[PDB]
Amino acid sequence: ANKELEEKNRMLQEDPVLFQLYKDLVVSQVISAEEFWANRSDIIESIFRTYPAVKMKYAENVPHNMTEKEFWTRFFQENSNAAIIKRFNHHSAMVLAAGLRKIALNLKKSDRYYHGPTPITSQDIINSFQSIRQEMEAYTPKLTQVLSSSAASSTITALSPGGALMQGQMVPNDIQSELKHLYVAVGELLRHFWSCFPVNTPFLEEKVVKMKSNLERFQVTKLCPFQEKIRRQYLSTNLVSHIEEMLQTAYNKLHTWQSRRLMKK
Amino acid sequence: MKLNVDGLLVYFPYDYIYPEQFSYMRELKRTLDAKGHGVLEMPSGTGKTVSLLALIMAYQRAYPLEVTKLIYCSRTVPEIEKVIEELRKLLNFYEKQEGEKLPFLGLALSSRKNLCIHPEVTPLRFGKDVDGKCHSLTASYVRAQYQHDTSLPHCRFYEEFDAHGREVPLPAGIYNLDDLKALGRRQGWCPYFLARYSILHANVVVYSYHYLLDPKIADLVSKELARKAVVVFDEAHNIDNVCIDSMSVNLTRRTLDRCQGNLETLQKTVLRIKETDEQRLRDEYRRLVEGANPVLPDEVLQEAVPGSIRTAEHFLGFLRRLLEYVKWRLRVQHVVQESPPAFLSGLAQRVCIQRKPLRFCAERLRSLLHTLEITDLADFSPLTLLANFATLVSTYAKGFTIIIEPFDDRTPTIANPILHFSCMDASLAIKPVFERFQSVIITSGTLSPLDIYPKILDFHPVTMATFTMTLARVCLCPMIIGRGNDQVAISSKFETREDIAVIRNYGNLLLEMSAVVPDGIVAFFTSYQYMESTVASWYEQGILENIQRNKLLFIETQDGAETSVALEKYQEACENGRGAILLSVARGKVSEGIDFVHHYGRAVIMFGVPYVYTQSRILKARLEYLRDQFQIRENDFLTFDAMRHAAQCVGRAIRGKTDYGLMVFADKRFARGDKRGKLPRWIQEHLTDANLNLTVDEGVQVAKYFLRQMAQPF
Amino acid sequence: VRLGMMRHLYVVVDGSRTMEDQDLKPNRLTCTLKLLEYFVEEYFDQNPISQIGIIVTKSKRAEKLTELSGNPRKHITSLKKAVDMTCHGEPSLYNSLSIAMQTLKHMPGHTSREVLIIFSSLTTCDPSNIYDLIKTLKAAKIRVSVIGLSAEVRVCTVLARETGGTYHVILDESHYKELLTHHVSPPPASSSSECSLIRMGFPQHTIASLSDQDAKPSFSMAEPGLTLGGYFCPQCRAKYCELPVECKICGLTLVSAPHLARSYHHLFPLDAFQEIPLEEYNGERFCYGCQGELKDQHVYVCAVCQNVFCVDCDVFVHDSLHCCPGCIH
Numbered sequence A: 001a002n003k004e005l006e007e008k009n010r011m012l013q014e015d016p017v018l019f020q021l022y023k024d025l026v027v028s029q030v031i032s033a034e035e036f037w038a039n040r041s042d043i044i045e046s047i048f049r050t051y052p053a054v055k056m057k058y059a060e061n062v063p064h065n066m067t068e069k070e071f072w073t074r075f076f077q078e079n080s081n082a083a084i085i086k087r088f089n090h091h092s093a094m095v096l097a098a099g100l101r102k103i104a105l106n107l108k109k110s111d112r113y114y115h116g117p118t119p120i121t122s123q124d125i126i127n128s129f130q131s132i133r134q135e136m137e138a139y140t141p142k143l144t145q146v147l148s149s150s151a152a153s154s155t156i157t158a159l160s161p162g163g164a165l166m167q168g169q170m171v172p173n174d175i176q177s178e179l180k181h182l183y184v185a186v187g188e189l190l191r192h193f194w195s196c197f198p199v200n201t202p203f204l205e206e207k208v209v210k211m212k213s214n215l216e217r218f219q220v221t222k223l224c225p226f227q228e229k230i231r232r233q234y235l236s237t238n239l240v241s242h243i244e245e246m247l248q249t250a251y252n253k254l255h256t257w258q259s260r261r262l263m264k265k
Numbered sequence B: 001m002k003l004n005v006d007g008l009l010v011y012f013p014y015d016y017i018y019p020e021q022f023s024y025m026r027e028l029k030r031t032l033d034a035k036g037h038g039v040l041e042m043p044s045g046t047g048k049t050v051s052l053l054a055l056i057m058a059y060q061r062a063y064p065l066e067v068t069k070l071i072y073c074s075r076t077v078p079e080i081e082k083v084i085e086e087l088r089k090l091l092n093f094y095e096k097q098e099g100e101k102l103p104f105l106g107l108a109l110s111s112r113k114n115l116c117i118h119p120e121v122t123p124l125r126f127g128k129d130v131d132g133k134c135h136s137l138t139a140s141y142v143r144a145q146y147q148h149d150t151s152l153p154h155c156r157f158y159e160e161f162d163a164h165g166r167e168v169p170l171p172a173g174i175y176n177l178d179d180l181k182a183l184g185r186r187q188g189w190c191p192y193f194l195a196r197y198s199i200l201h202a203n204v205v206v207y208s209y210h211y212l213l214d215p216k217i218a219d220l221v222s223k224e225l226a227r228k229a230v231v232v233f234d235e236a237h238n239i240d241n242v243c244i245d246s247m248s249v250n251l252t253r254r255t256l257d258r259c260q261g262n263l264e265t266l267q268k269t270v271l272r273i274k275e276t277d278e279q280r281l282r283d284e285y286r287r288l289v290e291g292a293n294p295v296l297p298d299e300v301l302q303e304a305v306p307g308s309i310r311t312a313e314h315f316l317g318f319l320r321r322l323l324e325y326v327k328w329r330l331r332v333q334h335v336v337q338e339s340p341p342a343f344l345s346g347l348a349q350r351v352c353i354q355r356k357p358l359r360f361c362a363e364r365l366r367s368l369l370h371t372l373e374i375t376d377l378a379d380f381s382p383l384t385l386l387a388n389f390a391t392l393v394s395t396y397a398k399g400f401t402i403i404i405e406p407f408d409d410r411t412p413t414i415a416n417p418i419l420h421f422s423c424m425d426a427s428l429a430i431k432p433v434f435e436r437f438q439s440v441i442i443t444s445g446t447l448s449p450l451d452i453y454p455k456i457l458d459f460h461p462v463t464m465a466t467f468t469m470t471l472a473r474v475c476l477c478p479m480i481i482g483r484g485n486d487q488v489a490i491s492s493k494f495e496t497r498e499d500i501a502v503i504r505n506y507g508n509l510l511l512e513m514s515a516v517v518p519d520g521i522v523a524f525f526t527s528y529q530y531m532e533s534t535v536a537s538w539y540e541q542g543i544l545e546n547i548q549r550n551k552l553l554f555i556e557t558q559d560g561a562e563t564s565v566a567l568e569k570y571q572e573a574c575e576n577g578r579g580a581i582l583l584s585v586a587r588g589k590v591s592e593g594i595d596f597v598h599h600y601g602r603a604v605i606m607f608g609v610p611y612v613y614t615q616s617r618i619l620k621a622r623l624e625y626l627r628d629q630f631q632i633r634e635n636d637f638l639t640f641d642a643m644r645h646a647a648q649c650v651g652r653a654i655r656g657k658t659d660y661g662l663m664v665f666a667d668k669r670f671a672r673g674d675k676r677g678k679l680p681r682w683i684q685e686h687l688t689d690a691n692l693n694l695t696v697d698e699g700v701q702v703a704k705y706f707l708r709q710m711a712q713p714f
Numbered sequence C: 001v002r003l004g005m006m007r008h009l010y011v012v013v014d015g016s017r018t019m020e021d022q023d024l025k026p027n028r029l030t031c032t033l034k035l036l037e038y039f040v041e042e043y044f045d046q047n048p049i050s051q052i053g054i055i056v057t058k059s060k061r062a063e064k065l066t067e068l069s070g071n072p073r074k075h076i077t078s079l080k081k082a083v084d085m086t087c088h089g090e091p092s093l094y095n096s097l098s099i100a101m102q103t104l105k106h107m108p109g110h111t112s113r114e115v116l117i118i119f120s121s122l123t124t125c126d127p128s129n130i131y132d133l134i135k136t137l138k139a140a141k142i143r144v145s146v147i148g149l150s151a152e153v154r155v156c157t158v159l160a161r162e163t164g165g166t167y168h169v170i171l172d173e174s175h176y177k178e179l180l181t182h183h184v185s186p187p188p189a190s191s192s193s194e195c196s197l198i199r200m201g202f203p204q205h206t207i208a209s210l211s212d213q214d215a216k217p218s219f220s221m222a223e224p225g226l227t228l229g230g231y232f233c234p235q236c237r238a239k240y241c242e243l244p245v246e247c248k249i250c251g252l253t254l255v256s257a258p259h260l261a262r263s264y265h266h267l268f269p270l271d272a273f274q275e276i277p278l279e280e281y282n283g284e285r286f287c288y289g290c291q292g293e294l295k296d297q298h299v300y301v302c303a304v305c306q307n308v309f310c311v312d313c314d315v316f317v318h319d320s321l322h323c324c325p326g327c328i329h
């Protein structure tokens, strides 16, 4: 059946982001659309489920020279006393049937945590210890020793923006939307490319997808510079180099791992 | 876990016993030491049997000569099956401590219908039909014909059992009904008769009350062999009803019409016999001159001479005359008639039937029936019922009454009148138990006060002990809601039953409670007719719909088939998160039969005091006699029946294992001191005055709080 | 007992009408949402590598309020929005569990899958039987620890114990915090649960090289403006505004060094300190930990450093700091 065609119509305009990027892959005629998707009331219903007699009646009494309003009328329609008990037990039973479809841890080296991932004679301790011991026999020099006008002023100058220890542009906005669209475009298609890359997948069926994905990386990125060229030749300002890293680094990973494949063989 | 009781050292399998258990064993030992019949109450349904059983095992070993055998009876076979498991567990623990087998045998008896291995009776389920087939297979003629080894199906299991079962008795072991059936199959012996033989030497024998009360069957299997036996009843609070029902016999127009047709078949059978077999069968007349069982107890039973009735032609006319008198006396249209001694005089004068010849009619019928080589007794079973009634009236009527109902209740005019012979005192049928057995312990739960039982049953108990369960956590949280949100009397009085507010209040209570009560809840009404009216009133209003939205609701009907299916669905709902509200009648067979455990009937609701229709004459005769004799007020007994019965159905939620469960009484009457006094000790003492008159909404709030405390673990 | 360092827990909340009832001081639904915010904020504050996803089940339908994520702020924002939720309907436990199972079915083996169901309405109307789902959950090694509200419902009782989780009920609002606070800690890994090594990358924060020379402008990765500097990836080479965030491309977890060091206190729980009320030859009137006079007859001591700690110090140490001050020496 044409299941895919119906799915495309539902998402054709309901969600812009999903369809927007898929078309872009075909706007420039990059690759076929087959690989795109291949890789990636209540009251009547309750009676419909609950009472089988109504279900049988509805099929046989399907609207024919009648009205739905008339059908609704037919719903509500000592011996009579027993009917309530039987109906409720039957009704309750039908509801029930309707909902029933047929290690202590141990370690060898705990010191490593104490000196964790963060990376990096004897007489000197004695000599230093004695010297400091006699240092504070004179105390309360606060009057002048703590600070001086020159020392204090020098600190203020340093704290100034020009001074040391105090080091200290949204012009493009319309282009921002295109980059975000491109960022999603890159993010959308790298995801599939990187979906199988981390896993070695030493199998032809799984590896074939890598080869198709690996080749598809060039096809998608073949059209990328053309759009980049137009944007770049506007003012030569606010260069976009980050977007190149994802494609260039994707190439390097592709080339390196592809080269590594030959070595393994 | 050996217990050094004051009387002796008693082995106990489980880890710990509550303080009430210490009182239980010593109290039981006191009666056993005194060798006198007594009555006691213990709340816990589970653990009571083992505690009761544990002392007997220790007592038997300490004083084997004092007590011969243990006769522990249970109300229903499904409940006796779990009892033997407790005994089996205890035996293994006791046997493990000893380290070797001991001369101890335990088994449970039952009807051939429930247990058997013969294929022919397997498809049949009716109890009467099973006996007819088994009797025919085991009939003397078949046994005599079995010797000839002619071409005819002979039940092999009994034939080889007599040659084998008689010679070798089973040394020891515990065999439940399911296990016993397998043993018979492998050994090719009757699971029924083999157990019957074992009663001669069986330390513990357990069976239902109907095997120990009705003289027709109980006497034969309960022979004097048990000169000094510790006979015990379990949950025998409604012992009188079972005991009285055994004596009570009902004769109806439909039954009478069947008897007339059966009698005609009996006449035809005699005619065939006369032309075919006369001399050989006539020898039984000499046996009769020389000199299904009679319902007369030991002393009452008489076998002096057959009397005037000595031949089939003469005896059949005797029944023909008696049947006609009952037929005419039953067809009379008038108010309900009572005539215990006058019926015998009226029958004797009307159709010239002396009582003494009539006393042996039932026994003569069986003897004559045997001579007829009938195919089965099931077809003629109604005739025997009339014969049993025929002899019972002619035997004694001091503590009995013949009640005739030309018009039945619930029908403006019915052409099927029923002749009732309901008894009035249960002491008559239970009397032989007390003399034959040195001591009887009536152990029961939800027991309304003991002092009445000696009045109802003519006996002198050694002790009257009431036990309240003692636990680290207060499992049961009873309450009475006599006032609703409208602060209006909610009593389900007969005159006040028609009140819409009272009906509305019950719906409000159930609706609100269902919101807080987790999966599993049961509601008990006073009668089916009242239950339908309350359901209909809720159905017309939105209360029932809201209850349905809150939880699933199930109602109970008279037919068992609907009840069984609905109950099975109920248990399914509790297992899932849907939950179910099972509306039932307190006096309905469903309530007594079913047991409620953890997450089953969590909040048992007692809608109104359970009372029977006072217009029922049969109850009046029973009620009137208790006022006439034994000095019991008419209202006292009527309240007693409700209080004892109300506690019966609501006490299941605390079965055992300290599974939290609350009980709510939706009636201000229970708050009355008289009702509380008749309330069982364990339920009564926990109940306090502060929560005695909780409002419908106030009761809900505390119920929610109660669940919180019980919800958390220990 | 070895714990599950990385866990994927789902906080299933019932949108049942019973939540409308106000047994507690505020509305029950608001109280759960208010306190659930504390758990969500605290859950990541004590387990960064873990991730959470909330589900709200109302009108017999289970809708994913928020997917699995590592940012408490996003989840907290949904909680604020959910305050004004209609809260009208009946929950479906099967629907909720089925939704979680689908998302959690594909989760890696190393992670410790978990589920926390806040059960309010005792009724549970479901399209199909749940026992079959219960069997699937055990095979899926998903720990479901329901927390009932005002009901010890049987259906959940079997769920927690059979599935390996824990069931609880709210005695009161104060007790409510303790129950969820308990689940903050990584639950111990049972015999059935297994463990495996997990690949991760440490994103070195980078800024403009030298006065905006060879700059790296970019906006974000899930109205973000251009950023002079931001976290990058060893493999994505994508600008991530904040950490820890799973690679939108690699699928490899990115996490800073301090975040991993945050959970080390779980591995080395501090031994409880014996409480002796009397002085017991303790000549130091001032508490060693806080240098404060002991106005109460209470003292705490280690088994190694053998120091003195008042009630306030011992409470603080075993509550937040998760280490003995003096015993570090």
Ligand code: SF4
Binding pocket: B112, B116, B117, B118, B121, B133, B134, B135, B137, B138, B155, B157, B158, B190, B191, B192, B193
């Ligand atoms: S004789 Fe034994 S085996 Fe045969 S029908 Fe009777 S009880 Fe069953």
Ligand SMILES: [Zn+2]
Binding pocket: C233, C234, C235, C236, C237, C247, C248, C249, C250, C251, C252
């Ligand atoms: Zn990455």
Ligand SMILES: [Zn+2]
Binding pocket: C287, C288, C289, C290, C291, C292, C309, C310, C311, C312, C313, C314
């Ligand atoms: Zn301190």
Ligand SMILES: [Zn+2]
Binding pocket: C302, C303, C304, C305, C306, C307, C324, C325, C326, C327, C328
């Ligand atoms: Zn220390």
